[PDB]
Structure 1
Amino acid sequence: ADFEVHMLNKGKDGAMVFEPASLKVAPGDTVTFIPKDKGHNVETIKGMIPDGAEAFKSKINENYKVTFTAPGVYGVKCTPHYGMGMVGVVQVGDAPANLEAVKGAKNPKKAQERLDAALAALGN
């Protein structure tokens, strides 16, 4: 399966957002992160990806396709706008085994609130 996520200056949950903020995918699925507005990228958050998965970081303005394989939660951010809360979550599979470890990760406050909301939306 193939998915799109937009990086936007504004959307449903306000300013500086990933839309959708959460996505539940299967191993081998692909996500294309599209900065439909200028000035955004996608980067894995430290401490918020499954053991073994590969960290990534796109270029600003790049439509960036990533394939997800290792099960669990993946926290992502927009590098320049992380402090503004510009984050999202991709979750591979139900019952993510790294949930405990990723809830322990430190994020700036607005990012943490939006990551907590995303993780709840994913059923956790």
Structure 2
Amino acid sequence: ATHEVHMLNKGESGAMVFEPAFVRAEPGDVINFVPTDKSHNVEAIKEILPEGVESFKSKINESYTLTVTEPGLYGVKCTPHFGMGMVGLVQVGDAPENLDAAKTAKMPKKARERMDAELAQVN
């Protein structure tokens, strides 16, 4: 299955946001990170990634197509807006092993607040 996440200046969820901020996927799924507005990208939060998953960083304003082969939690940020809390979360498969890592990973205050909100969706 394929999923889409938008990068936005302003949504219902606030300023500098990924929407949806949480994606539930299965191994082999595709996630498309697509700008709604200019100025954004997507980059892996290294401390919120499954084992063996390479970091990634898209170019500003480009759609980025991520295949989530490995199960677990994938945290993402927008590079210039990380401090403004622009973060998202993808859960791939059941019972993610890196839940604790995601709860404790160091990041800017607003990013941690939004990541904590996203973590509430883990199922």
Query: TM class by shorter-chain length?
Result: over 0.9
Letter in 1 for 2:76: V
Cα RMSD, aligned residues only: 0.8
Gaps of 5+ in 2: none
Structure 1 residues not aligned, in runs of 5+:
none
Identity %, equivalent residues: 67
**Corresponding residue number in structure 1 for 2:103:** 103
| Cα distance between partner residues in 2 of 1:15 and 1:37 | 12
Tell me how many residue pairs correspond in the alignment: 123
> What is the SS of the residue equivalent to 2:83?
helix
Q: Which amino acid aligns with 2:102?
A: V
In the TM superposition, structure 1's runs of 4+ consecutive aligned residues that sit over 3 Å from their partners are none
Aligned equivalents of 1:101, 1:86: Cα separation in 2: 19
Secondary structure in 2 aligned to 1:83?
coil
* Cα distance in 2 between the residues matched to 1:82 and 1:73: 18
Deviations 1:6-48 (A, max 9, x none): 0000112100000000001000100110011000000001211
Could you tell me the TM-score, scaled by structure 2's length? Answer: 0.97
Distance (whole Å) between structure 2 residues aligned to residue 46 and residue 32 of structure 1:
19
Task: Give 2:97's aligned amino acid.
Answer: A
One-letter amino acid of the structure 2 residue matched with residue 33 of structure 1: F
CA drift of 1:113 comes to: 0.6
2:119 pairs with 1:119: yes
How far apart are residue 89 of structure 1 and its match? 0.2
1:17-96 equivalences in 2 (<5 Å): 17-96=17-96
After TM superposition, give the deviation of residue 122 of structure 1 in Å.
2.5
**Per-residue deviation, 1:49:** 0.5
Name 2:2's counterpart in structure 1. Answer: 2
CA distance in 2, matches of 1:46, 1:93: 19
Cα separation, 2, equivalents of 1:119 and 1:60? 26
